[PDB]
């Protein structure tokens, strides 16, 4: 999308996997505010927004908290309490038409600066000293939007870059989206430390002979001793018995 009419999207209720981003591109800009990129794949958030648009080369520096510029002033502003990451990569391969791509436009004139995460689409004619002309030239009476003019020969300072901004949320989260929790192959008949979906204990695992009802996941004998557990992957029932011990 063009920057003055950027496109928000929500991502929730998934197992987010951030190991796909690195394989995309050399990532001319990849910086994160409030989080580290390597420790990103293990925390859970409520709702994750993704804001994607296209800007010029020497303006990628404006997508940052508290920076006053021209696109961070009139058509995309993000808070000073930001928490998330930004990712921008050069895409002169796909957006630059010969002769000029007058399809990516940006707001050049506005009455007042805009609030964080605010979008405006109206293309009303801008105000002048006196009552504007009418979507036409005059003393001022200018028109707000302006094109870009991408061409394949421009420097890497006026070449088009695609940029996507991820915004997270963390407070009082009945968490909806975290990372993948990798598993390991099962071992049977050996004293082993196990972690079945959160239930931690030790013992030797043996094939069970008791009929768990389909909505049950744990088994207990008298006095709360976890006696059995069903595998969360293949659903076979497994018996737990503590490995041998005694006095000498």
């Amino acid at each position, epitope marked *: 999308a063009s920057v003055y009419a950027w496109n928000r999207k929500r991502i929730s209720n998934c197992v987010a996997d951030y190991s796909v981003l690195y394989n995309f591109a050399p990532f001319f800009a990849f910086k994160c505010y409030g989080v580290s990129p390597t420790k990103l794949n293990d925390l859970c958030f409520t709702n994750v927004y993704a804001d994607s648009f296209v800007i010029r080369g020497n303006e990628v520096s404006q997508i940052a908290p508290g920076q006053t510029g021209n696109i961070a002033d009139y058509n995309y502003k993000l808070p000073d309490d930001f928490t998330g990451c930004v990712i921008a990569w050069n895409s002169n*391969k*796909l*957006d630059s038409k010969v002769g000029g791509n007058y399809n990516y436009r940006y707001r050049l004139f506005r009455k007042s600066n805009l609030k964080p995460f605010e979008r405006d689409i109206s293309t009303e004619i801008y105000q002048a000293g006196n009552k504007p002309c009418n979507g036409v030239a005059g003393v001022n009476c200018y028109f707000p939007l302006q094109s870009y003019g991408f061409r394949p020969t421009y420097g890497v300072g006026h070449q088009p870059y695609r940029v996507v901004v991820l915004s997270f949320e963390l407070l009082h989260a009945p968490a909806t989206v975290c990372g993948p929790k990798k598993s390991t192959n099962l071992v049977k008949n050996k004293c082993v430390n196990f972690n079945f979906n959160g239930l931690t204990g030790t013992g030797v695992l043996t094939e069970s002979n008791k009929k768990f009802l389909p909505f049950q996941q744990f088994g207990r004998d008298i006095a709360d001793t976890t006696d059995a557990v069903r595998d969360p992957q293949t659903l076979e029932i497994l018996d737990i018995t503590p490995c041998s011990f005694g006095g000498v």
Partner: antibody
Framework: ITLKESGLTLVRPTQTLTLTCTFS??????????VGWIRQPPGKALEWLALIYWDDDKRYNPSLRSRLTISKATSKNQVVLTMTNMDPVDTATYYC???????????????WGQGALVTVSS | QSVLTQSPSASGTPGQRVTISCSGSRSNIGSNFVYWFHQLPGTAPKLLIHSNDQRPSGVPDRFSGSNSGTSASLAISGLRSEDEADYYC???????????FGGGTKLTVL
């Protein structure tokens, strides 16, 4: 990636030319992708007619503007070109060509059709 | 100003290096990319070099391009007998707002 032209190859003067490039291996919905037309008289140099990007930017040859209309039919994965008021000087071969992305700059005319010899006579 | 000019003949000899010139103007060749095509008798052309210095995958190394001001050159090394065909320039002229082409060069090996 393949392209193929089709239409009527022979028409009298003061008539209209229609041509249809049906392609395979790319879609005019991705970014980058575009399709164009280029004519060449017999034994002369090439000439650019029109171009249509993926976002529907119908560029035309100015000197041949006011005569050309290019349109796409993406549902059938085909493009239609139309040029009115044919003349015997418009006898040429018409290729439909493809412009996709490269590695640091867009590629243009990397793949060509096979031409469609068009004769304007009686 | 609005037309690129090429010499009609190159006339090298096997295993030699030859050059093909392309003269443009301030408005098209000096401010845009220069392509170089190669059309053999009875067949659609085939790209050789885009962006003045890059070769599409599948063209031998012996083809080289050069842009200098408002002029253009293609350098063919190791001249062989399978290269006698038409070579065309192409560049976008902002003043004309259209693609423009050259005359063409013969390049017949002996």
């Amino acid at each position: 990636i393949t392209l193929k032209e089709s239409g009527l190859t022979l028409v009298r003067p003061t008539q209209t030319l229609t041509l249809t490039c049906t392609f395979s291996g790319f879609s005019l919905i991705n970014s980058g992708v575009g399709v164009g037309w280029i004519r060449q008289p017999p034994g002369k140099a090439l000439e650019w007619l029109a171009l249509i990007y993926w976002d529907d930017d119908k560029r035309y040859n100015p000197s041949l503007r006011s005569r050309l209309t290019i349109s796409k039919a993406t549902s059938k994965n085909q493009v239609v070109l139309t040029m009115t008021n044919m003349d015997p000087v418009d006898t040429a071969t018409y290729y439909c060509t493809h412009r996709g992305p490269g590695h640091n700059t867009p590629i243009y005319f990397e793949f060509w059709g096979q031409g469609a010899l068009v004769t304007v006579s009686s | 100003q609005s037309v690129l000019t090429q010499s009609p003949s190159a006339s090298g000899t096997p295993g030699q290096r030859v050059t093909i010139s392309c003269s443009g103007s301030r408005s098209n060749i000096g401010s845009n990319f220069v392509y170089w095509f190669h059309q053999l008798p009875g067949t659609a052309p085939k790209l050789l070099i885009h962006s003045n210095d890059q070769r599409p995958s599948g063209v031998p190394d012996r083809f080289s391009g050069s842009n200098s001001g408002t002029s253009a050159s293609l350098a063919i090394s190791g001249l062989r007998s399978e290269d006698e065909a038409d070579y065309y320039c192409a560049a976008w002229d902002d003043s004309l707002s259209s693609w423009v082409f050259g005359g063409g060069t013969k390049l017949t090996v002996l």
